[PDB]
Amino acid sequence: AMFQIGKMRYVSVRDFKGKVLIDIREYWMDPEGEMKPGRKGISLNPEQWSQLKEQISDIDDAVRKL
Amino acid sequence: AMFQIGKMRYVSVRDFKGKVLIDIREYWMDPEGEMKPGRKGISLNPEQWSQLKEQISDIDDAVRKL
């Protein structure tokens, strides 16, 4: 699965080894026609996924404080 | 502005030159005792940040579907 959160920024979500590969990274175009991640990005650990969502309320609040 | 979202992974919402950036990066402890931001991570702006939260309804579905 490939979601999008911004221009040239897609979220890679697929089966990998023995876990769900959730990688949020910039997506560049392949010479052929596909798209793949670059360098700027971070993978969302299954455990981090929950913590991040829960911290969103505080994170978002900090954004409005700046 | 330092929100822990996992182990060695912290979301830092800092204003950079007049731009509130939600930098989701890793932090490794130096020999001194301070956590320094690693090279692996991504700086999301409020715009992409909003989309990320909105895309959760889609991403979470793929994560909850093992």
Partner: peptide, 26 residues
């Protein structure tokens, strides 16, 4: 495929780093 496969082999690089560390404890 040129970049597709290239930016795939390096997926496990962060998989065994970011996608594998929170389940280590807590």
């Amino acid at each position: 495929y040129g970049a597709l496969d290239m930016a795939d082999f390096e997926f496990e690089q962060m998989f065994t780093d970011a996608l594998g560390i929170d389940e280590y404890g807590g």
